[PDB]
Amino acid sequence: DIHSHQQALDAYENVLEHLREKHIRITETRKAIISYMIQSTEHPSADKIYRDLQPNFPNMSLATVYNNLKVLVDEGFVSELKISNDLTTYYDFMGHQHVNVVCEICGKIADFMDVDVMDIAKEAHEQTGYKVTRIPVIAYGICPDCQA
Amino acid sequence: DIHSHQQALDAYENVLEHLREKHIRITETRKAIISYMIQSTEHPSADKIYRDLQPNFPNMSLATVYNNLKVLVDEGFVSELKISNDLTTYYDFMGHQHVNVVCEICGKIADFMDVDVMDIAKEAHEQTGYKVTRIPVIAYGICPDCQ
Ligand code: NI
Ligand code: NI
Ligand SMILES: [Zn+2]
Ligand SMILES: [Zn+2]
């Protein structure tokens, strides 16, 4: 659903804002899972997430990973999927972000909600083998007032 | 479909590269039509393109617009569409582009084929009303050799 935070926000800061708005608890474990999911090449299984994060989180169980994933799914920031003939569920961080457009004439700035930059990081990794670290984006255009 | 021209190219630059590789002529009018199609915010008819471009092209007829659109359709950069209760053809630009990824450690550059930046432009227009002119995109990451 289309909305604004009156500023650009990356996927990570976006989720945290949305959760705070909904008065949802945000632990360090939850932040770590969110950050891992965002930065992830693949669509990791819960076990993958767990195995990669456990060493830095002593009180973490697999149950903790699944429980957090359920909340992120229910709040619409990750999606669950299965592939054919495979019993494991795979998780995909698909949370949106907010990016700026600048008027090339009057320099006025507006923001918009984006879900496509994620698919670019994936297309890049698939074709090139790079582990994608960041894809910083800003759009340029002509604001409605300058179109008139 | 996935391929490289060994350089980043935007949607416009990409179409010209593709046409060149097939030794297809590229006139000023063909360039103007490619650009128009890329920057259109609604699916234009041939007459819309014609009426908008003709003042800069005394050479141009409606035929020239249709002929150029046909070439662009045949080369995979535009598609035709029909709507209910209208006999007129409308056109959609569907060409991809090529963007770089830069390795943060060693600086090696590779490129990949992209179709999503155009969707970003569309979302920006729909939500904000701005006419999008450009979205410079460069990806950064860790190249296979460095990892
Ligand atoms: Ni948001
Ligand atoms: Ni190409
Ligand atoms: Zn302006
Ligand atoms: Zn490298």
| Separation between Cα atoms, residue B98 and residue B10, nearest integer Å | 6
Ligand 3 center from residue A147 Cα (angstroms): 7
Torsion of CA A20, A23, A25, A26, to 10 degrees: 0
Whether residues A40 and A72 fall in one domain = yes
| Separation between Cα atoms, residue A56 and residue A31, nearest integer Å | 13
Query: Using the beta-carbon criterion (under 8 Å), do A131 and B112 form an inter-chain contact?
Result: no
DSSP run (H or E) holding A134: strand A131-134
Select the residue of B127, B129, B143 nearest A113 (Cβ to Cβ): B127
CATH code at position B109: 3.30.1490.190
* Beta strands B78-81 and B90-93, pairing class: antiparallel
Centre a 10 Å sphere on the Cβ of residue B38 and count the other Cβ atoms it contains. 19
Q: Which of B77, B94, B111 is the last residue of a domain?
A: B94
**How far B39 CA lies from chain A's nearest CA (Å)?**
11
Q: What is the resolution of this structure in A?
A: 2.0
Domain count for chain A, please give it.
Answer: 2
Torsion of CA A58, A63, A66, A68, to 10 degrees: -60
Of B78, B82, B91, nearest in space to B47 by CA:
B91
Select the residue of A113, A129, A141 nearest B133 (Cβ to Cβ): A141
User: Which residue out of A116, A134, A138, A143 would a mutagenesis test of the B interface target, given it has the greatest number of B Cβ atoms within 10 Å?
Assistant: A116
**How far A8 CA lies from chain B's nearest CA (Å)?**
13
Whether residues A79 and A132 fall in one domain = no
Whether residues B4 and B73 fall in one domain = yes
A76 is written with which tokens? Answer: 């619409």
Residue A90, chain B, CB below 8 Å: the answer is no
Q: Which of A94, A111, A136 is the last residue of a domain?
A: A94
Contact B144, B106 (CB under 8 A): no
CATH code at position A34: 1.10.10.10
Question: Which residues is B114 bridged to in the sheet?
Answer: B97
Chain A hits for B132, Cβ within 8 Å: 101, 139-141
Ligand 2 center from residue B115 Cα (angstroms): 10
Whether residues A112 and A52 fall in one domain = no
| Separation between Cα atoms, residue B78 and residue A5, nearest integer Å | 36
Whether residues B57 and B109 fall in one domain = no
A2 is written with which tokens? Answer: 């289309």
Q: Which of A68, A94, A120 is the last residue of a domain?
A: A94
Residue B106, chain A, CB below 8 Å: the answer is no
Burial B117-139 (b: 16+ CB within 10 A, else e): bbbbbebbbebbbbbbbebebeb
Query: Using the beta-carbon criterion (under 8 Å), do B139 and A138 form an inter-chain contact?
Result: no
* Beta strands A139-142 and A97-103, pairing class: parallel
Question: Which residues is A97 bridged to in the sheet?
Answer: A114
Torsion of CA A100, A2, B40, B135, to 10 degrees: 20
Ligand 1 center from residue A69 Cα (angstroms): 19
Centre a 10 Å sphere on the Cβ of residue B95 and count the other Cβ atoms it contains. 20
Whether residues A136 and A68 fall in one domain = no
Contact A141, B41 (CB under 8 A): no
Contact B68, B29 (CB under 8 A): yes
**How far B83 CA lies from chain A's nearest CA (Å)?**
27
Of A97, A111, A83, nearest in space to A34 by CA:
A97
Residue-range definition of the domain harbouring residue B135: 95-147
Neighbours of ion ligand 2 (CB under 5 A): B 14
Contact A7, A98 (CB under 8 A): yes
Beta strands in chain B (DSSP E): 78-81, 90-93, 97-103, 109-114, 131-134, 139-142
Whether residues B38 and B83 fall in one domain = yes
Chain B hits for A123, Cβ within 8 Å: 112-114, 116
Of B100, B95, B96, nearest in space to B8 by CA:
B100
Whether residues B8 and B43 fall in one domain = yes
Select the residue of A113, A127, A134 nearest B140 (Cβ to Cβ): A134
* DSSP label of B77: S
Whether residues B88 and B134 fall in one domain = no
**How far B132 CA lies from chain A's nearest CA (Å)?**
4
B9 is written with which tokens? Answer: 């190219």
